[PDB]
């Protein structure tokens, strides 16, 4: 029984997409939604939705929306899933095993890859602990690969967490950028703010 709609085009079609360690989040509510168009949009090559089939999702009501977007290398996409392993999953961003929502992704070689390499996207290969579900704890401490306390100084057994990526049009598809958005729905017993079009 609401009037407001969400700027899905403004949020998604926006060129600015974050990295993986500092992925960007949006809290969407009070909005009349239409995801059928986004579904057939196809642009987002990937479509894996968990907890609901995307077809019945359209008319559904949702308590709140979290859109988490970033750009990823081609081969690492499989590491993003509920209950999934991988260097990103265990070291950049971990999904809950109970994740409800859908992961969508598009290439963007023509947008995010440069022949000189677009190293604006960093990845934390090194962490002191594994990643909890929905954990964005941006820590750049120089990890001490050896027994000597590095004291934040590189050198013998003193490596850095964030390594950049060589996103180029010359890159392989598995080594090329991909614009990825995950939609998470906390369908708790809280009244829904976003719904589908029916009386």
């Amino acid at each position, epitope marked *: 029984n609401i009037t407001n709609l969400c700027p899905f085009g403004e949020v998604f079609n926006a060129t600015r997409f*974050a*990295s993986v360690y500092a992925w960007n989040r949006k809290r969407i509510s009070n909005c009349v939604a239409d995801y059928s168009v986004l579904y057939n949009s196809a642009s987002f090559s990937t479509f894996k939705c968990y907890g609901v089939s995307p077809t019945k999702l359209n008319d559904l009501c949702f308590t709140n929306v979290y859109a988490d977007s970033f750009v990823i290398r081609g081969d690492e996409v499989r590491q993003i899933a509920p209950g999934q392993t991988g260097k990103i999953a265990d070291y950049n961003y971990k999904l809950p095993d109970d994740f409800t929502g859908c992961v969508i992704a598009w290439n963007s070689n023509n947008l995010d890859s440069k022949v000189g390499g677009n190293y604006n996207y960093l990845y934390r290969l090194f962490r002191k602990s594994n990643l909890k579900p929905f954990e964005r704890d*941006i820590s*750049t401490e120089i990890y001490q690969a050896g027994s000597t306390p590095c*004291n934040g*100084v590189e050198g013998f057994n*003193c490596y*850095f967490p*964030l390594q950049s990526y060589g996103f180029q049009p010359t890159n392989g598809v598995g080594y090329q950028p991909y614009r990825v958005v995950v939609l998470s729905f906390e369908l708790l017993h809280a009244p829904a703010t976003v719904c589908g079009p029916k009386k």
Partner: nanobody
Framework: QVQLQESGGGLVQAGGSLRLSCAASGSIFSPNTMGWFRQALGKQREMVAVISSIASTQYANFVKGRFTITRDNTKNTVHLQMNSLIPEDTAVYYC?????????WGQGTQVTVSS
């Protein structure tokens, strides 16, 4: 759309000194972490220092003990003073803003030193 205003580069002989600066004029949610990365022609990105507003140092060994960083908490600007310059150190440097939501970048300050 946070903007990272960079200035303080140029041409300097061997052993000289310059003073870079980057300023985050955007939202800057919560505390930030303001950094410098270097990229020479034909090479990838290497982090000079990822000093935070609070602590944690994060100095590299490449120019260990020659560059320094100062915090100005009034305007949340960060100034990078370079001393005893060498041709190897010279490259293009971008300011960095970690922020709480996502990361941003500078637009470039050329550093060239030779004799």
């Amino acid at each position: 759309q946070v903007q990272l205003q960079e200035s303080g580069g140029g041409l300097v002989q061997a052993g000289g000194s310059l003073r870079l600066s980057c300023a985050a004029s955007g939202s800057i949610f919560s505390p930030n972490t303001m950094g410098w990365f270097r990229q020479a022609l034909g090479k990838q990105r290497e982090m000079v220092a990822v000093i935070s507003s609070i602590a944690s140092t994060q100095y590299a060994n490449f120019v260990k003990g020659r560059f320094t960083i100062t915090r100005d908490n009034t305007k949340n600007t960060v100034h990078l003073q370079m001393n005893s310059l060498i041709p190897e150190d010279t490259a293009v440097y971008y300011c960095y803003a970690v922020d709480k939501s996502q990361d941003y970048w500078g637009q470039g300050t050329q550093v060239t030193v030779s004799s």
